[PDB]
Amino acid sequence: ALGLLRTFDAGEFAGWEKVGSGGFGQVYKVRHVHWKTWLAIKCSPVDDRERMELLEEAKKMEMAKFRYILPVYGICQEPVGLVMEYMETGSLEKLLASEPLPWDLRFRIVHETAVGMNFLHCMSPPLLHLNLKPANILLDAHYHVKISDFGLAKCFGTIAYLPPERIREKSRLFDTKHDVYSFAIVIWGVLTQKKPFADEKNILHIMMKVVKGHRPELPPICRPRPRACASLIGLMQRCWHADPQVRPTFQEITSETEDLCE
Ligand SMILES: [Cl-]
C-alpha cells in the first residue's frame, strides 16, 4: 500500500502556483523538472498526527487506483505534502459557475462520477468517500471526471451534502448510503448549475427542515433532453430519500446513468 509511493524533495519541483486553499490548505500546481509534467501538491498548515493522517490519505488513494479516481504519486517532506496528479480544468464547482453546459456532457459527468463511487463501494471492505461534492470532483483537459479529496474517507457549505440521518442521530455509523445522498446533491448541481441552498441564510432552519424531508427545489424539465432530464430528476429524488435503506446502491445508480449517456 505505502511501498510503491515515492518520497519527493522540494528541489524536484519548480514553478509553484497556488490553485486552492482552506482547511487542508495550500494546494499547488508544480512542475516536476525531471519528469517534465505538472503535478499537484497539497501542503500542511507540523506534528506526527498530520504525518500519519496524510500517509493514510495516500494509502487510501493508492488502494483505489482507478480510471475515475485521482492518482497519487507520493509524499513531499520539505514542506510535508501529498503529491498527486494535476487536473488542468479544475473542479466541477468552477465548471458549473462558468457557463451553460451541453446536456450530453452533464450526463457524462454524472455517469463517470457514479462509476467512480461504485468502484469505491465495490472494494472489500467498501471505501466510503464522505466528502463528495462538485468542489472535490476534478476534471481533466477533456472534461472526464476524477474523484478527489480522500481526507475524510473511511475503511459551512458541506451542510447541503450532509445526509439527514447525520443530523437526526448524534454519532451514527457511516455507510454507503451517506455517499449516495451526497451524490443526489451533486446531481442537483449538475441539473441547475447552482449551489444548493445558496439563497437561504438560516442554516439551522433549513437543516431542521431537511430532517423532515425538505430538499433543494426540483428543477423544471429541460427543453433539449426532456426524457433523460426527467429520468435523472427521478434518480436524484431516490438518492436523497429520507430513509437511507430506500436509496439506491451505486450498482443500481450506474445502470441508470449509463442509459442517460445513450
Ligand atoms: Cl431526451
Curated annotation (Swiss-Prot):
UniProt crosslink position (Glycyl lysine isopeptide (Lys-Gly) (interchain with G-Cter in ubiquitin)): 42, 133
Modification after translation: May be phosphorylated by MAP3K2 and MAP3K3. Proteolytically cleaved by during Fas-induced apoptosis.
GO biological process, any: morphogenesis of an epithelium
Superkingdom, natural source: Eukaryota
Disruption outcome: Conditional skin knockouts in embryos show significantly thicker skin and aberrant skin stratification with Krt14 expression extending into the suprabasal layers throughout the epidermis. Adults show a similarly thickened epidermis, with expansion of the spinous layer and basal cells independent of proliferation rate. 60% of adults develop spontaneous facial tumors when aged.
TM region positions: none
Entry's Gene Ontology molecular function annotations: ATP binding; protein serine kinase activity; protein serine/threonine kinase activity
Ranges where the Protein kinase domain occurs: 13-260
Key words of the record: ANK repeat, ATP-binding, Cytoplasm, Isopeptide bond, Kinase, Membrane, Nucleotide-binding, Phosphoprotein, Receptor, Repeat, Serine/threonine-protein kinase, Transferase, Ubl conjugation
Tissue and organ distribution: Expressed in the epidermis of the skin (at protein level). Ubiquitously expressed, with an abundant expression in the thymus, bone marrow, pro-B, pre-B and immature B cells and a weak expression in the spleen.
GO cellular component annotations of the record: cytoplasm; cytosol; intracellular membrane-bounded organelle; plasma membrane
Active site annotation, chain numbering: 131 (proton acceptor)
Family, similarity comment: Belongs to the protein kinase superfamily. TKL Ser/Thr protein kinase family.
Subunit structure: Interacts with PRKCB. Interacts with TRAF1, TRAF2, TRAF3 and TRAF5. Interacts with BIRC2/c-IAP1, BIRC3/c-IAP2 and XIAP/BIRC4.
Further comment found in the protein's record: May act as a tumor suppressor in the epidermis when exposed to dermal carcinogenic agents.
The name this protein goes by in its record: Receptor-interacting serine/threonine-protein kinase 4
Source species: Mus musculus (Mouse)
Higher taxonomy: Eukaryota, Metazoa, Chordata, Craniata, Vertebrata
Full-length numbering of the shown residues: 10 to 288 of 786
